[PDB]
Amino acid sequence: ADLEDNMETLNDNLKVIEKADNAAQVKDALTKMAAAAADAWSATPPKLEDKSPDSPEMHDFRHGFWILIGQIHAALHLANEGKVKEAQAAAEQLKCTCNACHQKYR
Amino acid sequence: ADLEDNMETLNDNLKVIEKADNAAQVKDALTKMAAAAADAWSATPPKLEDKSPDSPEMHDFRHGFWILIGQIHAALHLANEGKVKEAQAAAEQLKCTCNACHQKYR
Amino acid sequence: ADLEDNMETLNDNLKVIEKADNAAQVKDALTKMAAAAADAWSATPPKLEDKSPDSPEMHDFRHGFWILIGQIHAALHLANEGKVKEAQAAAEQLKCTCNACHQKYR
Amino acid sequence: ADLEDNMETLNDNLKVIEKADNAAQVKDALTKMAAAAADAWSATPPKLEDKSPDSPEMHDFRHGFWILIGQIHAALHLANEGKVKEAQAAAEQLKCTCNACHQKYR
Ligand code: HEC
Ligand code: HEC
Ligand code: HEC
Numbered sequence: 096a097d098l099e100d101n102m103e104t105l106n107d108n109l110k111v112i113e114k115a116d117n118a119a120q121v122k123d124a125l126t127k128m129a130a131a132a133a134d135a136w137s138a139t140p141p142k143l144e145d146k147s148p149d150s151p152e153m154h155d156f157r158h159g160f161w162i163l164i165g166q167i168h169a170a171l172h173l174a175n176e177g178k179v180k181e182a183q184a185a186a187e188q189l190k191c192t193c194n195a196c197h198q199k200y201r
Numbered sequence: 202a203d204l205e206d207n208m209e210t211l212n213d214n215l216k217v218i219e220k221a222d223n224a225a226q227v228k229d230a231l232t233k234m235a236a237a238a239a240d241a242w243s244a245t246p247p248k249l250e251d252k253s254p255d256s257p258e259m260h261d262f263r264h265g266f267w268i269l270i271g272q273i274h275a276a277l278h279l280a281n282e283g284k285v286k287e288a289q290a291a292a293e294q295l296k297c298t299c300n301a302c303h304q305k306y307r
Numbered sequence: 308a309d310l311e312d313n314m315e316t317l318n319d320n321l322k323v324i325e326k327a328d329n330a331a332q333v334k335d336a337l338t339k340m341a342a343a344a345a346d347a348w349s350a351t352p353p354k355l356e357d358k359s360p361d362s363p364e365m366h367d368f369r370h371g372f373w374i375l376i377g378q379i380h381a382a383l384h385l386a387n388e389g390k391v392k393e394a395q396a397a398a399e400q401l402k403c404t405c406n407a408c409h410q411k412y413r
Numbered sequence: 414a415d416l417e418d419n420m421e422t423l424n425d426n427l428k429v430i431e432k433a434d435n436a437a438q439v440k441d442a443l444t445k446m447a448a449a450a451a452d453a454w455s456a457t458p459p460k461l462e463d464k465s466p467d468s469p470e471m472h473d474f475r476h477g478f479w480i481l482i483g484q485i486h487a488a489l490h491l492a493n494e495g496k497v498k499e500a501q502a503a504a505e506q507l508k509c510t511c512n513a514c515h516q517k518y519r
């Protein structure tokens with residue numbers, strides 16, 4: 096999609112997890128978010144349309160995305176091991192990368 | 202997806218990346234493999250239908266999707282950093298994980 | 308340290324962790340847990356002294372060592388933000404990875 | 414310990430990883446760089462002695478060791494499967510997270 100769209104894609108599935116009924120709901124959000132990640136991972140955001148894509152600062156906006164996905168599929172290692180409340184909670188305790196990025200980069 | 206088509210996409214991108222020129226195809230191909238081995242996460246294997254789905258075998262079967270998916274995203278990290286070939290590199294070392302499964306759960 | 312030793316260390320620091328009181332008292336045994344898991348990662352127990360170091364069945368064994376200290380730090384990663392009972396919770400899913408391996412190769 | 418000397422632990426061990434020819438040298442070096450990361454993780458650098466441990470400057474700063482030990486361990490993977498060319502070829506690559514959190518927070 097586009098950097099801004101992707102970001103609402105993840106605003107969606109992150110409350111649909113918090114809402115999560117079952118273990119497929121979670122499983123499906125987490126999918127459509129690492130899906131939704133990668134797409135962001137390759138964008139240049141507003142601010143840093145001045146830093147090279149080689150810049151230390153782009154590595155890191157790009158590494159914010161790294162981190163995120165690791166946090167996601169580690170939520171998926173808890174959705175697929177039968178326990179959703181702990182997966183749900185990895186998905187809340189996830190906003191720490193979210194705000195991390197924004198503050199640096201939005 | 203069904204397992205063996207997930208596995209086919211997996212294999213097919215493992216060839217793309219192997220035969221890739223630049224940052225995109227690697228990124229695009231590893232982005233595909235992601236969703237792919239994401240999906241197989243839950244998909245169930247024949248040889249483990251006679252183990253509970255909340256068993257240490259089934260845990261340790263899904264756990265190999267955890268991994269896999271990460272070497273993929275770690276490679277994506279170098280793909281998404283311009284380090285084209287060494288994403289191709291990372292692509293090949295992946296294959297410890299893929300195998301390690303096959304020799305346990307195929 | 309050889310095998311059994313890295314283990315009980317990993318298995319003592321677990322108890323230390325469950326009961327402990329502060330994020331810095333649960334830190335240092337999640338670091339202990341790790342450091343030992345690093346030294347366990349070179350190991351080759353009896354059930355796999357059987358097979359080769361290039362064996363995939365060797366590679367899968369030294370992969371729960373990858374997983375584990377992966378999630379050890381996902382657990383270390385919560386202590387550091389004042390999240391104690393969450394990172395003591397991570398300490399408890401994290402043993403489905405002690406699980407995985409024992410059910411295969413001990 | 415205080416973070417200061419942690420950040421010269423890490424550096425030299427890079428000196429001592431690209432000053433290897435074989436496993437343990439590249440396999441142990443990386444070992445203690447993980448301890449190196451582990452303790453630093455908790456410390457408040459000079460430049461955030463004004464912000465709260467709940468703050469997204471800190472969340473992010475100490476997320477940067479999260480990564481690191483991933484990139485380290487991940488290069489210890491290949492160190493343990495025997496792959497020195499591939500774990501050294503990969504330790505110097507971690508580079509772009511050394512110099513990523515420097516430029517931001519150092
Ligand atoms: C590295 C990313 C991988 C590649 C390349 C392939 N796989 Fe797998 N895989 C696994 C099992 C138990 C099967 C059996 C299929 C079934 O029973 O229906 C498969 C299947 C395949 C196939 C072909 C299957 C066919 O009949 O056509 C290919 C070509 C293939 N896989 C390639 C196990 C696993 C697994 C468990 C965690 C890992 C991660 C991978 N395989 C990874 C790869
Ligand atoms: C937390 C993640 C873990 C705990 C807690 C324990 N293990 Fe391990 N383990 C593994 C093997 C292959 C052995 C063989 C023992 C031998 O060498 O004879 C063990 C052993 C233990 C022991 C008993 C030690 C003794 O004989 O005196 C305990 C209490 C124990 N383990 C607890 C394999 C693995 C492994 C593979 C990657 C995982 C990650 C762990 N074990 C993890 C834990
Ligand atoms: C690794 C970096 C990264 C993290 C992670 C990230 N964002 Fe963003 N986010 C950005 C950037 C850059 C912008 C501003 C992009 C722009 O203005 O074009 C942004 C902006 C947004 C926007 C503005 C949308 C718009 O269309 O104007 C929303 C909504 C948002 N983030 C939600 C989220 C949520 C929810 C999460 C976690 C589920 C998240 N973001 C995680 C980098 C990130």
Ligand code: HEC
Nearest residue numbers: 416417420423424458459474475477478510511514515519
């Ligand atoms: C998570 C953030 C982060 C990581 C990752 C990081 N640094 Fe540091 N670095 C810092 C901070 C903060 C300081 C300031 C040290 C102080 O005086 O407390 C620093 C300082 C240093 C120094 C100067 C030591 C001094 O006494 O001033 C060196 C050398 C250094 N880092 C090397 C490295 C290397 C090599 C790596 C990667 C293996 C690395 N750093 C990774 C944050 C980081």
Ligand SMILES: [Cu+2]
Nearest residue numbers: 191192472476
């Ligand atoms: Cu965090």
Ligand SMILES: [Cu+2]
Nearest residue numbers: 154278509510
């Ligand atoms: Cu990087």
